């Protein structure tokens, strides 16, 4: 059964099987990445005919987030369990999308309100959940050795979600709204 009940008193296992409390900074870090991954799934479910071009990359992000979570759940000192996530290829992939979407949409010099279409608005929610997960990752980094490649990718990912949100509005001919002061 998926329910083992071993977590009923508030403790759980990480990779390698060491037991931690569920509020441990490590468990909060990969838990927030799981929350982000679920929100990306929700965002993907809002795609329509006008925004289908974004579907493949959202699913790829979900696969990458699983790799990131895996590494966050992995203690550095247990040599039986290696980190799997390498930032270079996925991060350059995000950057290419950021550059492309920044070029195509109307240039702004002011902050935008996070909103517009349902999909663009969901991409802004994704942007802010990514940044929340990043804060938890940094809390963990300050106490334990982490795969720093995960932090590089998670940082870049919220810039991706910002650029993708603007692109989603552009795909539905929805202008962005500027902050008034």
């Amino acid at each position: 059964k998926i329910y083992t009940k071993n977590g009923d008193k508030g403790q759980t296992r990480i990779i390698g099987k060491q037991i931690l409390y569920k509020n441990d900074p490590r468990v909060a870090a990969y838990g927030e990445v799981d929350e982000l991954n679920s929100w990306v799934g929700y965002t993907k479910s809002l795609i329509n005919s006008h925004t289908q071009v974004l579907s493949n990359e959202l699913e790829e992000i979900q696969q990458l987030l699983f790799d990131c979570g895996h590494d966050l759940a992995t203690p550095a000192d247990d040599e039986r369990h290696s980190f799997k996530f390498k930032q270079e290829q996925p991060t350059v992939w995000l950057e290419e999308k950021i550059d492309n979407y920044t070029q195509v949409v109307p240039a702004v010099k002011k902050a935008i309100l996070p909103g517009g279409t349902q999909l663009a608005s969901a991409l802004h929610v994704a942007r802010t959940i990514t940044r929340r997960a990043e804060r938890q990752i940094v809390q963990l980094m300050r106490e334990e050795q982490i795969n720093q490649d995960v932090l590089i990718f998670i940082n870049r990912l919220s810039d991706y979600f910002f650029a993708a949100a603007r692109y989603a509005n552009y795909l539905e001919q929805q202008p962005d709204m500027l902050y008034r002061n």
Copy 2:
């Protein structure tokens, strides 16, 4: 008026009327349960003709979450205020649903990406918000005596949301996607 302004300097009351700061671990715990309850309401609003079978149980979860929040807001040592939540019946109810939904959907041996239909994706968001609330409950448990029955139910509840998310995809003939490595 619902606005009393007594909370304007960042303090508030729990059951029994003792005053705590709004960032107190207790207030964060039942606040996260309120956030979960609101997300379950949102998830319920996404039900359609194909997924109506899930409506009653989502509303029942909302009623149960109110009982859970009540107990988390109740200090153990104030004998004027008793715990109301007893885990056995609601938890066995969740387990029966987990068993039923696990049986009906295609068996997997790999992790799934959290996503699919809008409803299944919302049920995965519910799964991860439940787990976030659980972490806050454990933070509170480590400082204060709690109704441990709430923790048992909240633990089981995120396994319910996982099984229900797979079932929602099944109800709309949407396959789950496997993690690639």
Copy 3:
């Protein structure tokens, strides 16, 4: 480029340019306000013909939340950067809406389940995210001097979202459901 990479090791700048870790209580506070602002954008995107009357005020809240975030990112002691947010006018505006929406909808004497229409349910999610951001603001207040006007408005704002959620249900002829005990 929007990606500078200066945040790749988990530190970032606030207003005035001092560097903090991304898990610093200040950065968590205005980060949670950004998350709220994105959720308000998402909520606004769910408006339909029956609920158009709520569109202007949601966008106004988004502009106000930017002012609030600005002040939370501003250290009190750096006199080069003044607080911009003054609570009186926006807070009285919220209160007038609370009074109006409380009058129009069916009176209750019991707690309601947070749910109903998709929009009303999203307004309850907004209510609980506002309250989460409030907890982070109070964490910051307990360590650093803040613009206390932001806390007054953020407190009142979750009462606004509660009253607006009930009003959204009323606009679509959806009754609220009461807590059963």
